[PDB]
Structure formats: structure tokens, C-alpha cells
Design a protein around this ligand. Structure first.
Ligand SMILES: Nc1ncnc2c1ncn2[C@@H]1O[C@H](COP(=O)(O)OP(=O)(O)NP(=O)(O)O)[C@@H](O)[C@H]1O
Ligand SMILES: Nc1ncnc2c1ncn2[C@@H]1O[C@H](COP(=O)(O)OP(=O)(O)NP(=O)(O)O)[C@@H](O)[C@H]1O
Ligand SMILES: N[C@@H](Cc1cccc(Br)c1)C(=O)O
Ligand SMILES: N[C@@H](Cc1cccc(Br)c1)C(=O)O
Ligand SMILES: [Mg+2]
Ligand SMILES: [Mg+2]
Ligand SMILES: [Mg+2]
Ligand SMILES: [Mg+2]
Lengths: 260, 260
């Protein structure tokens, strides 16, 4: 009979599409040697043929999707002023105040893209024709309790449109086209606030402005937008049981264990 | 006569290929209105035609270059254990100890890619055929004195090959092909340590292993590698006078000022 620790070891080596049962009568050492062999071949194949990282390649696919649809690709600072968090309405009554990675006296790792997107919307409105369509992909940081759905270091897609055409229908059409393009099943459940759900997993929270917070950021126009976690998308796409398989990590490469 | 502050304002609005002299007899207000008009059209053009961010697009070009040459694309944690810094030999006698952005009791923002690359080399050597070729592009953080060549938040390309073919000649051929592909003039000046210089600007430091540090990381094979700052590459390519034009930023979009 396999010990719980032995079973832990084998599941780190197991692939979702693997069709091997750790409940058969085969000893640990051979089940382990079997899976080690498969995982080395998986990496050998990636090394020989494609060589692209899941998270990098997804960011590039999401980028071409939004560029082709008219959204300006933004790359803004990850290390942001702590004041941006207060100006987002994040008091201490909210959960997210406890979750901030502080850096100096006045800085933090950004837990969200909304402050920088807001700032880009305000500035670009003096130069670009209506509507203004932007998006960003990059790291975000939140302190979290251990979760199969939460990382402390993750990657956020955020997009936002300001001005004409900022309706909920249009926002749902963007979400729908986007996840149908990626091959990710979802349901949309719900100014407006809506969530994009995969079963009980939140893929995205989206929103329809104007909202009173906009005033603090110099925004006085309608808008629509959404944020998606890239690792959650990978988790669903590749059927990973734990989101750590999809993270920036030294433990996993494209969901294959690197401890062989 | 233009004040120094007025001239500061105009140079923020000026483009390297702009052919306007702030030393002519035209008043501030019209020189400013002239340049505002140009910069809005530059952004309008980007918005209408291509919409890709300089830093994102360069990362994608560098990625295809190294993937096509057989290097495995790595994305490893940006937030790393503080112990990785000591194990890199970064004592307090080195400059770099003072430059670390500490995060909790035990973490920091990575100032370099070498620890994670080292860890990937060790683990992948149990699975991949010789030679092992990896690379990574992503954020790095260092506290710096105000410089026209230094950002506190920048982007590093790092690549490393381990095993056979790890000669200085091969390392220079990779560097040479890479910068000729990008259209960036350079000179290489110099186990071995070499620098890739553009005038007095350091594009890259490279190295040839084995070196005694390798032992601490579980590496006992020869290697070659180099690190390049992406913003420095953009600075040279686009002839920016100050590296802030190329940074993750809310002040500049593809080197065009966003304060119009
Ligand atoms: N810790 C995290 N790890 C991975 N993805 C995350 C994390 N926090 C947020 N996301 C993703 O970012 C999206 C937008 O952020 P947000 O709406 O603020 O998340 P949230 O409300 O905190 N979701 P949740 O914590 O699961 O209830 C989420 O829907 C997730 O896709
Ligand atoms: N603060 C920074 N801002 C931008 N690029 C940087 C920064 N620090 C390092 N780089 C880039 O990363 C490369 C590899 O890092 P490293 O060799 O450690 O730099 P370095 O020796 O500190 N160079 P320098 O500080 O200019 O004398 C450098 O050659 C630069 O291209
Ligand atoms: N609140 C998260 C997700 C996000 C991003 C952009 C627009 C919208 Br609406 C929601 C964040 O600020 O990144
Ligand atoms: N020292 C910097 C640059 C670098 C990266 C990889 C290999 C080599 Br050699 C140099 C860093 O560690 O990122
Ligand atoms: Mg949360
Ligand atoms: Mg939410
Ligand atoms: Mg330095
Ligand atoms: Mg150097």
C-alpha cells in the first residue's frame, strides 16, 4: 500500500491526461520510475519542437487578440505608489488592504491594474479619438491564504474602453469572443459589475462605468472593462488541479514537474 | 529668451528625429503648441496602425530569436528568496547588496536572473540532452542613483548554455548575431568575463564558466551566458537621451510624452 507521502510524490509527477492509477498493485518505485520517464520525454519534446513557455505564449496570444481588436498595448510600472491603493477606495474595511506587499515607505507591488489603466485613460483622452481602448498584461502581487486557486505572484490581463460604445452588451461580446478564441468554457453572472465564472472558479471580474470612484482619477466618461488572471486561464485550459502548475515557478515548466 | 523650465518642458515634448531648435526666436507658447500637435499625431498614428508597446514588442522579438536558436523560454519568479542573493556571493563589500529591494523578512525583488537560471540549469540537466540552452526576459529591480542610464525597475534578458559548445567564440557569435539582428551597434571588450559596450553605455555583461560560484548552485559543467537590459537596447535603438523614455512608465508611451 502506498503511503500518503509516496502518493504526494507521484501526483507531482502525474499529468492530467495521464492514464495511470496510483491505486493499482504496482510498487512506488516502479510507478515513480514510470512517471519520471514520461515527464523527461515531455520536456525533451518541448525542448526539441516548440520551446515556448505557457505563460509567455498566452500573454502573446492575448496581446495579438486585443491589438487586432483596436486596444493599445500598455506596459506600466509594477512597483507603484502606495497612495494609488488608497485612491482606489481600498480602506482597511476591504479585504485587499491586508493583501498589499509593501516595499518602501511609499511603494508597493501592484495588486491590480486599475490605477495605471485609469491614469492612461485620462492622459490618452487628450490625444486619441473616441473611443479609447487600452489593455495591459503583467505581474500583480497579493498576499493570500494557501489556495489551489490563488498565487501570491500572478499575471493579470486588464482591458478598458472609455467613451462611446461602453455598454454591457459590448462588454459581454468582448468577453465572449475572447474566451471562445482561447477555448475556455465560462458563464457570465451578474453601474454594473459582472463575474466570468468557470464552475466555481472566478476567471474575471468586469465592470461598467461611470462610477463615483472615477472622479478621483480624472475620469468623467463612461467605460467598460475586465480583469482576467492568466494562470487561472491556464489551469482551466490544461485541467491542472492546482494553480501552482501554471505559475512563474522553478517547480513546474509548462505544468511538468522540474524535480525529476 | 526661453527659461530653463520652459526648455525642460519643450524637451519632454521633443522627439530625437524632430528638427526644431529651441534656440530660435519663436515664443515658448508656439513652440509648445507646435510640439504638442506633433506628439498627438504620433500617438494617433500608433493607435490607428500598430498599437504595440516598445517593451512588449522587443521582448517578443528577442523571444523568437532565442527560441529559433534552440533556447528554452523560461519565466521564473520575480519575487525571490533573499538567500539567493547571499548565495550569489553578494556580500556587503559588493555594491549590489545596497541595491536590493527587500520585501518581507525573507524575500526581495530580484536584481538579476542568475539565481533562477542556475536553478533551471541544474534541474533540466536531469532531463534534457546536452547542451542545455535557456533564456528569460522579465522585470528586475535595483536601487540606483539618478542616472540617464539607470532605472530602478528594468527588464533583463538573460541567456545561458551549459555543457558542450561553451566557448568564448560561441558566446561572441551569439552576441554578435543577436545585436546585428536588432540593428544595434556594439563593441565587445574583455573564467572569462566580457562586456558589450555601446560607446560608454554597457549593453551587457557576459561570462564563461566554470567558476567557483557554480558549486553552490549544483552546477559542475562549463557554461556561457550574458545579460542585456532591454530599456538600454531601446535607448540606443531609438536614440533616446534619457532611459526613462523607454521604461515601464506612465510618463512615456513608446518614447512619446503622455503629458499633452
Ligand atoms: N491571488 C490570485 N491568484 C491568481 N489570480 C488572481 C489572484 N487574485 C486575482 N486573480 C485574478 O484576477 C482577476 C481580477 O482580480 P479580482 O477581481 O480583484 O479578484 P478577486 O475578486 O480577488 N477574485 P477571488 O480572490 O478569487 O475571489 C480574478 O478574477 C482572477 O482571475
Ligand atoms: N538599473 C538598471 N537599469 C537598466 N538596465 C540595467 C540596470 N542594471 C543593470 N542593467 C542592465 O543589465 C545588464 C546586466 O546587469 P549587470 O551586468 O549586473 O549590470 P551592471 O554591472 O550593474 N551595469 P552598470 O550598473 O551600468 O555598471 C547591464 O549590462 C545592463 O544592460
Ligand atoms: N480589479 C482588477 C481587475 C480589473 C482590471 C481592469 C479593469 C477592471 Br473592471 C478590472 C484590477 O484592477 O487589475
Ligand atoms: N548578472 C545579470 C546578467 C546575467 C544574466 C544571466 C547570465 C549572465 Br553571465 C549575466 C543577471 O544575473 O541577471
Ligand atoms: Mg481575492
Ligand atoms: Mg473579483
Ligand atoms: Mg550597476
Ligand atoms: Mg556589468
Amino acid at each position: 500500500a502506498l503511503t500518503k507521502s509516496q502518493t504526494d510524490r507521484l501526483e507531482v509527477l502525474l499529468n492530467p491526461k495521464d492514464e495511470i492509477s496510483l491505486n493499482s498493485g504496482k510498487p512506488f518505485r516502479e510507478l515513480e520510475s514510470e512517471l519520471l520517464s514520461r515527464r523527461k520525454k515531455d520536456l525533451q519534446q518541448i525542448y526539441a519542437e516548440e520551446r515556448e513557455n505557457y505563460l509567455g505564449k498566452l500573454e502573446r496570444e492575448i496581446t495579438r487578440f486585443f491589438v487586432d481588436r483596436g486596444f493599445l498595448e500598455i506596459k506600466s510600472p509594477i512597483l507603484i505608489p502606495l497612495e494609488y491603493i488608497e485612491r482606489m477606495g481600498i480602506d482597511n474595511d476591504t479585504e485587499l488592504s491586508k493583501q498589499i506587499f509593501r516595499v518602501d515607505k511609499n511603494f508597493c507591488l501592484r495588486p491590480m491594474l486599475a490605477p495605471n489603466l485609469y491614469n492612461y485613460l485620462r492622459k490618452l483622452d487628450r490625444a486619441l479619438p473616441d473611443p479609447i481602448k487600452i489593455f495591459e498584461i503583467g505581474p500583480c502581487y497579493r498576499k493570500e491564504s494557501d489556495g489551489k486557486e490563488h498565487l501570491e505572484e500572478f499575471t493579470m490581463l486588464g482591458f478598458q474602453q472609455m467613451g462611446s460604445g461602453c455598454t454591457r452588451e459590448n462588454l459581454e461580446s468582448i468577453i465572449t469572443d475572447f474566451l471562445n478564441h482561447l477555448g475556455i468554457d465560462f458563464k457570465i453572472v451578474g453601474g454594473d459589475t459582472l463575474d466570468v465564472m468557470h464552475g466555481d472558479l472566478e476567471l474575471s471580474s468586469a465592470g461598467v462605468g461611470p462610477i463615483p470612484l472615477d472622479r478621483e482619477w480624472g475620469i468623467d466618461k463612461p467605460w467598460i472593462g475586465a480583469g482576467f488572471g492568466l494562470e487561472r486561464l491556464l489551469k482551466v485550459k490544461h485541467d491542472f488541479k492546482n494553480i501552482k502548475r501554471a505559475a512563474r515557478s522553478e517547480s513546474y515548466y509548462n505544468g511538468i514537474s522540474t524535480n525529476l
